[PDB]
Motif scaffolding. Structure first.
Motif: not given
Length: 113
Positions: A32-38, A40, A42-43
């Motif tokens: 989820r995190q690594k995907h959240a940034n992608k 753009d 918030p986690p």
């Protein structure tokens, strides 16, 4: 004024499955995190703990089952592919049970495209 109240409480999960959920959950959170940034976002925006927890419980391998998850809105689930995608492997490599839903679908062997 008003007066709130408290709800019931379920017993701890048997190590049998509990553990599996513990180890899995962690994997999902990471994705989820690594995907959240992608995207753009918030986690928390991407997927709230509420969603992750459910996914770690039902262990949905197909986007179809994911959509049924609580919190997830129709379609959105899709973008959350990288999430369930990890569950399919985590269980596929550990022969762990999945799709523990109630209303499942048969296998008539479809054919399109």
């Amino acid at each position: 004024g008003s007066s709130g109240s408290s709800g019931s409480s379920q017993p701890v999960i048997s190590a049998q499955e509990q553990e599996t959920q513990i180890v899995l959950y962690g994997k999902l959170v990471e994705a989820r995190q690594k995907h959240a940034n992608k995207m753009d976002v918030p986690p928390a925006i991407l997927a709230t703990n509420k969603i992750l927890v459910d996914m770690a419980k039902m262990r949905p391998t197909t986007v179809e089952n994911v959509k049924r998850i609580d919190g997830v809105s129709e379609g959105k689930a899709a973008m959350l592919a990288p999430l369930w995608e990890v569950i399919k492997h985590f269980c596929q490599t550990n022969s762990v049970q999945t799709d523990l839903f109630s209303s499942t679908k048969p296998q008539s062997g479809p054919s399109s495209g």
